Amino acid sequence: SSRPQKKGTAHHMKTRPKKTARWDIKRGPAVYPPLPPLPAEWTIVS
Amino acid sequence: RVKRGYIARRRRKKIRFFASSFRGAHSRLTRTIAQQKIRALVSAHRDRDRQKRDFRRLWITRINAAIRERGVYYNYSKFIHDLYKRQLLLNRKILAQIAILNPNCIYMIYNEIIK
Amino acid sequence: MKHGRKIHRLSRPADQRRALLRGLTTQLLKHGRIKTTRAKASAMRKYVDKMITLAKEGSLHKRRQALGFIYEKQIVHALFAEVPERYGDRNGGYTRIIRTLPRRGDNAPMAYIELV
Amino acid sequence: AVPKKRTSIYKKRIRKNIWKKKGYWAALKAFSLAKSLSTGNSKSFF
Amino acid sequence: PGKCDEITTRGYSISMSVDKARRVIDQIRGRSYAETLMILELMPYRACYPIFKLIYSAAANASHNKQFNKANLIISKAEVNKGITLKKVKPRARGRSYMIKRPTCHITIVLRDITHFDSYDKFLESLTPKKLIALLGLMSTGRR
Amino acid sequence: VLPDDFQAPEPGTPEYNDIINQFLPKKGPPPPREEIFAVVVIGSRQYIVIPGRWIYTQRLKGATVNDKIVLNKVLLVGTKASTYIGTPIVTNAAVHAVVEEQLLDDKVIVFKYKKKKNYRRNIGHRQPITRIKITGITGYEDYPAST
RNA sequence: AGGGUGAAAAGAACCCCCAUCGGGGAGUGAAAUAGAACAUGAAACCGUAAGCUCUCAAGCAGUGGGAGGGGGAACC
RNA sequence: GGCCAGUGAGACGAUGGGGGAUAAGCUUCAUCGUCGAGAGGGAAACAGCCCGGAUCACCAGCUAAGGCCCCUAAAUGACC
RNA sequence: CGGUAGGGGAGCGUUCCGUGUUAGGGAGAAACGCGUGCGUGAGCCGCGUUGGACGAAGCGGAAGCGAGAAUGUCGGCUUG
RNA sequence: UCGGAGAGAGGCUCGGUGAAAUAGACAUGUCUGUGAAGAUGCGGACUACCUGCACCUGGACAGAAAGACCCUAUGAAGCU
């Protein structure tokens, strides 16, 4: 004994998924080419 | 000035009818017919939003298999490097739908992507 | 466990079971037919056969045996003074257990004894 | 010693059915006794 | 409607438990009159006698009332139903008291004689439709 | 009373068989529409659409019934021997339409509540859909990528 | 605690099963599946018949997807 | 200011501390967060940790926290 | 535009009354169901049966006015 | 010690009459883990054809009596 144990909430901070590798923390999503705009989608003109 | 009621019987026949094919006391025994009713509506919500989420999942795995059919290491991952680099306006995981109906077409898609 | 014990006993205690067999055989030897539940039929079968053979040998001693078993006095005298003609050379196996419908009230299996 | 909770209709129908059916098996016996008691050689039923 | 191929013979509150009368009544469903007759005659069940008296008062109630045979005469449905039940207070130790009920059966038996137009072959001939209705007195798995 | 009995037909049934047979099985013909196949974009979502068909869509911006329409934002027009696949859209790909009655799709009971925390909300919702029919497809000739 | 057949008992002649309990015809009545433990008759609960289905199962038993089949020929 | 409420023993987490034995899912106060009164995804299950805030519909898409062998989505992807 | 305690706004429904010995009604008033008809919803229109007598709508009024929670309570029924 | 056999009445089976307390609904597995910190109802793994009858009582924090011990109430009552 002489060592406490880690309970609810307390247990969570020790043992939740952390992304502890500086690299993957850094990253950002792909961007893209700007994708020039798109036409209308509907027309009464018929 | 008695004011007695019958509006319960309708209040309650209505439910009594919405809980049909509930296979137990959940279909006869009014005082539980109520809470059952409540719980069917709730699972209607959760199963509805989860159905959007769930059909994405199903098409990801289905398109994923059609792409891996090429015997070389392709993916649903890398297929999308190459499907957005070449501007295709979002066939919306419904290329996963033709992938099972017009498979030759999906091989045409796939070859144009590889170029 | 029963294993080995072959004394057919009825629904009754010892004393009363004795009494039932003695009275019941008396009334058989009196009338010739009888109607008892099947179990009583078997238990009869043994003893009444004993009385018959006891009359097949009409010496005093045996006559006093039977005089001691059967209740009714004169059914004995009629019996041994009558049977060593009836059952001359029948030589064992004297009854017959022609059985019959159950007993409305218990659905108790009910049988119907003879002397033949 | 005291039951917790009433049984369903389901279970009870099962057991009542076993009761009655236990009566089912004990007819065809009586029907054999009948179909044999229709006049015939036999040593029973004086 | 059964069209006279049915002769209901309803029952009084015959003073016996519903469920036991139901084990014999379930016994006798479908069998032709002769069998169930000779069975209920010899059945070792108390609830068998009043059912018997009923049946025989249904055959005989269907021979001169309608006019049928008995050899071609089966027990079609033969249902039981509960009836009025009475309530007794029998007392018991430490001053408690318990209702002892007192049930009543309520039997309806629907015998069934046999009346047949008689059809020689399976083939159908979409003709005499008005007549056809009369012809199809009773059919199984009919379609169209 | 009395049984119905035989009646009086005494007539042998017609044995032509064939006339009766023509009468017995009903005719089936089903048309071929054509060999063409499109994927259009309405609202935000897409549809595999083939000429002559219903689609329950969102297009309730404004369009009365018994109408005619060009769903010009088309992509992946594919025939049944070749296909044309295009960047975002394939040019000149009118998928002509016939707008008709603007329904209210069936009720969807949204019903929310928590637990002991004592509330609940019986509310429903009709998404005003529009059931479009598709007449034909056009201008898919350019840049065919079919093979 | 126990109310409500019918407008009028017209409350059931006669027949059959029949320990005269209770029934099926016949008859009355507009109607008696209104027949005397009778006027509408809900729910719990007790059955019956038809349609589809459960015996390597795991579940507050529903829900979203729906295999297979039955229904009048896309809806249940 | 008017007319009117409910509330009055909160819990944990982070920090600075008292008491305790720098023991407690302990107790007591000060400044903040979540729960209380709040759903959803990660955490296997799991109020009080992380992202995040639920008007509804959508058999549309991009991401956050977290992840990509199978059960479950996604590289059994690259090189040190 | 989450939301318990709680506050405010807008409504439905039931028995009865005013408009009435109303409109309608023995070709047939209410309880059961087919209509995802209709409503955000409480509920409303239609639709049928052996029986079968009353009674809407609209604009208003009043309340013995809305129930699964009180080891409630009266009756009928089950489980064992 | 160290049990054993026996007779009777029950138990057991068949015919007849026929209760009870309890009971949210229960389609009512084991081990571990979790969780108001001792779950068939959650998670993972194992195990288990459906359903009877007899038999035992470890659980369902089993029934019984809104605990009788402890505390509180500006409760009641008795005695000094």
mmCIF file of C-alpha atoms in Angstrom, chain E:
data_model
loop_
_atom_site.group_PDB
_atom_site.id
_atom_site.type_symbol
_atom_site.label_atom_id
_atom_site.label_comp_id
_atom_site.label_asym_id
_atom_site.label_seq_id
_atom_site.Cartn_x
_atom_site.Cartn_y
_atom_site.Cartn_z
ATOM 1 C CA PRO E 1 -72.846 -19.372 -42.492
ATOM 2 C CA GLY E 2 -71.951 -23.042 -42.881
ATOM 3 C CA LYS E 3 -75.261 -23.308 -44.741
ATOM 4 C CA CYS E 4 -76.870 -25.945 -42.548
ATOM 5 C CA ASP E 5 -73.615 -27.885 -42.391
ATOM 6 C CA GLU E 6 -73.499 -26.807 -38.758
ATOM 7 C CA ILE E 7 -75.682 -27.432 -35.738
ATOM 8 C CA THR E 8 -74.648 -25.399 -32.726
ATOM 9 C CA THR E 9 -75.688 -26.825 -29.361
ATOM 10 C CA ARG E 10 -74.919 -24.216 -26.774
ATOM 11 C CA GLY E 11 -74.435 -25.027 -23.114
ATOM 12 C CA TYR E 12 -75.593 -23.902 -19.704
ATOM 13 C CA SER E 13 -73.240 -22.823 -16.982
ATOM 14 C CA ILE E 14 -72.374 -26.473 -16.390
ATOM 15 C CA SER E 15 -70.986 -26.397 -12.910
ATOM 16 C CA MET E 16 -67.372 -27.387 -13.485
ATOM 17 C CA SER E 17 -64.053 -25.685 -13.997
ATOM 18 C CA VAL E 18 -63.497 -24.306 -17.455
ATOM 19 C CA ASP E 19 -59.993 -25.593 -17.909
ATOM 20 C CA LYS E 20 -60.652 -29.268 -17.243
ATOM 21 C CA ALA E 21 -63.663 -29.340 -19.510
ATOM 22 C CA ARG E 22 -61.141 -27.784 -21.878
ATOM 23 C CA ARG E 23 -58.740 -30.688 -21.703
ATOM 24 C CA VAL E 24 -61.417 -33.108 -22.750
ATOM 25 C CA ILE E 25 -63.005 -30.719 -25.242
ATOM 26 C CA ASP E 26 -59.601 -30.238 -26.818
ATOM 27 C CA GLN E 27 -59.364 -34.004 -26.880
ATOM 28 C CA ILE E 28 -62.413 -34.410 -29.107
ATOM 29 C CA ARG E 29 -61.864 -31.810 -31.853
ATOM 30 C CA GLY E 30 -62.143 -33.082 -35.427
ATOM 31 C CA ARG E 31 -62.984 -36.706 -34.734
ATOM 32 C CA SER E 32 -66.205 -37.993 -36.179
ATOM 33 C CA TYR E 33 -69.239 -38.485 -33.995
ATOM 34 C CA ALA E 34 -68.943 -42.253 -33.560
ATOM 35 C CA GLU E 35 -65.421 -42.138 -32.120
ATOM 36 C CA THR E 36 -65.882 -39.232 -29.728
ATOM 37 C CA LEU E 37 -69.083 -40.906 -28.667
ATOM 38 C CA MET E 38 -67.477 -44.202 -27.702
ATOM 39 C CA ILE E 39 -64.596 -42.351 -26.073
ATOM 40 C CA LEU E 40 -66.614 -39.998 -23.907
ATOM 41 C CA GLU E 41 -68.665 -42.997 -22.873
ATOM 42 C CA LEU E 42 -65.544 -44.600 -21.385
ATOM 43 C CA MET E 43 -63.325 -41.581 -20.650
ATOM 44 C CA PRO E 44 -61.995 -41.425 -17.095
ATOM 45 C CA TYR E 45 -62.857 -37.743 -16.674
ATOM 46 C CA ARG E 46 -65.585 -36.126 -14.633
ATOM 47 C CA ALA E 47 -65.907 -33.291 -17.113
ATOM 48 C CA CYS E 48 -66.528 -35.975 -19.725
ATOM 49 C CA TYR E 49 -70.053 -36.863 -18.752
ATOM 50 C CA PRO E 50 -71.784 -33.478 -19.236
ATOM 51 C CA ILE E 51 -69.891 -33.042 -22.500
ATOM 52 C CA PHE E 52 -71.278 -36.429 -23.460
ATOM 53 C CA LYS E 53 -74.873 -35.554 -22.665
ATOM 54 C CA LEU E 54 -74.298 -32.424 -24.732
ATOM 55 C CA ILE E 55 -72.939 -34.209 -27.812
ATOM 56 C CA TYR E 56 -75.695 -36.786 -27.855
ATOM 57 C CA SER E 57 -78.149 -33.988 -27.505
ATOM 58 C CA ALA E 58 -76.495 -32.539 -30.573
ATOM 59 C CA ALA E 59 -76.588 -35.561 -32.832
ATOM 60 C CA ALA E 60 -80.176 -36.235 -31.853
ATOM 61 C CA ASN E 61 -80.738 -32.532 -32.174
ATOM 62 C CA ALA E 62 -79.454 -32.729 -35.706
ATOM 63 C CA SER E 63 -81.259 -35.833 -36.971
ATOM 64 C CA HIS E 64 -84.921 -34.835 -36.622
ATOM 65 C CA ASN E 65 -84.466 -31.067 -36.424
ATOM 66 C CA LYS E 66 -82.436 -30.883 -39.553
ATOM 67 C CA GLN E 67 -82.292 -34.337 -41.020
ATOM 68 C CA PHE E 68 -78.823 -35.863 -41.171
ATOM 69 C CA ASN E 69 -77.033 -39.138 -40.587
ATOM 70 C CA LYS E 70 -74.550 -39.776 -37.804
ATOM 71 C CA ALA E 71 -71.829 -41.796 -39.530
ATOM 72 C CA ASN E 72 -70.785 -38.840 -41.710
ATOM 73 C CA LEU E 73 -70.991 -36.271 -38.929
ATOM 74 C CA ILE E 74 -67.910 -34.734 -37.314
ATOM 75 C CA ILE E 75 -67.193 -32.301 -34.493
ATOM 76 C CA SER E 76 -66.172 -29.111 -36.254
ATOM 77 C CA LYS E 77 -65.053 -26.638 -33.600
ATOM 78 C CA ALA E 78 -66.335 -27.485 -30.080
ATOM 79 C CA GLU E 79 -65.330 -24.418 -28.114
ATOM 80 C CA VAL E 80 -65.478 -23.771 -24.369
ATOM 81 C CA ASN E 81 -65.794 -20.394 -22.705
ATOM 82 C CA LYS E 82 -65.800 -19.205 -19.137
ATOM 83 C CA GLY E 83 -69.006 -18.166 -17.473
ATOM 84 C CA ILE E 84 -70.315 -16.634 -14.289
ATOM 85 C CA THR E 85 -68.093 -17.541 -11.361
ATOM 86 C CA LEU E 86 -69.248 -17.414 -7.773
ATOM 87 C CA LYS E 87 -67.330 -16.316 -4.719
ATOM 88 C CA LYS E 88 -67.229 -17.939 -1.297
ATOM 89 C CA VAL E 89 -65.380 -16.734 1.774
ATOM 90 C CA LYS E 90 -63.761 -19.591 3.418
ATOM 91 C CA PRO E 91 -61.945 -18.596 6.617
ATOM 92 C CA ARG E 92 -58.521 -19.651 7.744
ATOM 93 C CA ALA E 93 -56.086 -19.466 10.634
ATOM 94 C CA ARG E 94 -55.013 -16.292 12.402
ATOM 95 C CA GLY E 95 -58.267 -14.727 11.316
ATOM 96 C CA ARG E 96 -57.534 -14.465 7.602
ATOM 97 C CA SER E 97 -60.126 -15.183 4.932
ATOM 98 C CA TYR E 98 -59.818 -16.337 1.358
ATOM 99 C CA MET E 99 -62.215 -16.242 -1.543
ATOM 100 C CA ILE E 100 -62.777 -19.669 -2.993
ATOM 101 C CA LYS E 101 -64.186 -19.247 -6.463
ATOM 102 C CA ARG E 102 -66.702 -21.502 -8.145
ATOM 103 C CA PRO E 103 -66.495 -21.615 -11.915
ATOM 104 C CA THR E 104 -68.885 -22.536 -14.724
ATOM 105 C CA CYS E 105 -68.230 -23.782 -18.214
ATOM 106 C CA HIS E 106 -70.035 -22.492 -21.254
ATOM 107 C CA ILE E 107 -69.692 -24.880 -24.190
ATOM 108 C CA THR E 108 -70.776 -24.455 -27.787
ATOM 109 C CA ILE E 109 -70.302 -27.422 -30.107
ATOM 110 C CA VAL E 110 -70.783 -27.171 -33.853
ATOM 111 C CA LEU E 111 -71.228 -30.551 -35.469
ATOM 112 C CA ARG E 112 -70.847 -30.814 -39.212
ATOM 113 C CA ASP E 113 -72.536 -33.257 -41.583
ATOM 114 C CA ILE E 114 -71.278 -33.600 -45.153
ATOM 115 C CA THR E 115 -72.999 -32.187 -48.248
ATOM 116 C CA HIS E 116 -71.034 -32.342 -51.510
ATOM 117 C CA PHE E 117 -71.855 -31.132 -55.021
ATOM 118 C CA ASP E 118 -68.951 -33.266 -56.266
ATOM 119 C CA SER E 119 -66.493 -32.182 -58.982
ATOM 120 C CA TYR E 120 -64.748 -34.709 -61.250
ATOM 121 C CA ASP E 121 -61.687 -32.711 -62.376
ATOM 122 C CA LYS E 122 -59.332 -29.872 -61.468
ATOM 123 C CA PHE E 123 -59.662 -27.916 -64.716
ATOM 124 C CA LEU E 124 -61.639 -24.678 -64.433
ATOM 125 C CA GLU E 125 -64.130 -23.381 -66.994
ATOM 126 C CA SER E 126 -64.858 -19.658 -66.465
ATOM 127 C CA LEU E 127 -68.494 -20.314 -67.409
ATOM 128 C CA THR E 128 -71.826 -20.221 -65.591
ATOM 129 C CA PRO E 129 -70.359 -17.640 -63.230
ATOM 130 C CA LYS E 130 -73.726 -16.913 -61.619
ATOM 131 C CA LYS E 131 -74.192 -20.672 -61.349
ATOM 132 C CA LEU E 132 -70.542 -21.004 -60.320
ATOM 133 C CA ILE E 133 -71.272 -19.290 -57.015
ATOM 134 C CA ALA E 134 -73.782 -22.021 -56.224
ATOM 135 C CA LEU E 135 -71.271 -24.651 -57.347
ATOM 136 C CA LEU E 136 -68.427 -23.473 -55.119
ATOM 137 C CA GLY E 137 -70.094 -24.371 -51.835
ATOM 138 C CA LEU E 138 -66.727 -25.062 -50.234
ATOM 139 C CA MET E 139 -63.164 -24.890 -51.574
ATOM 140 C CA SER E 140 -59.612 -24.867 -50.203
ATOM 141 C CA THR E 141 -56.873 -22.459 -51.300
ATOM 142 C CA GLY E 142 -59.125 -20.901 -53.938
ATOM 143 C CA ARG E 143 -57.588 -18.180 -56.102
ATOM 144 C CA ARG E 144 -58.688 -15.406 -58.471
#
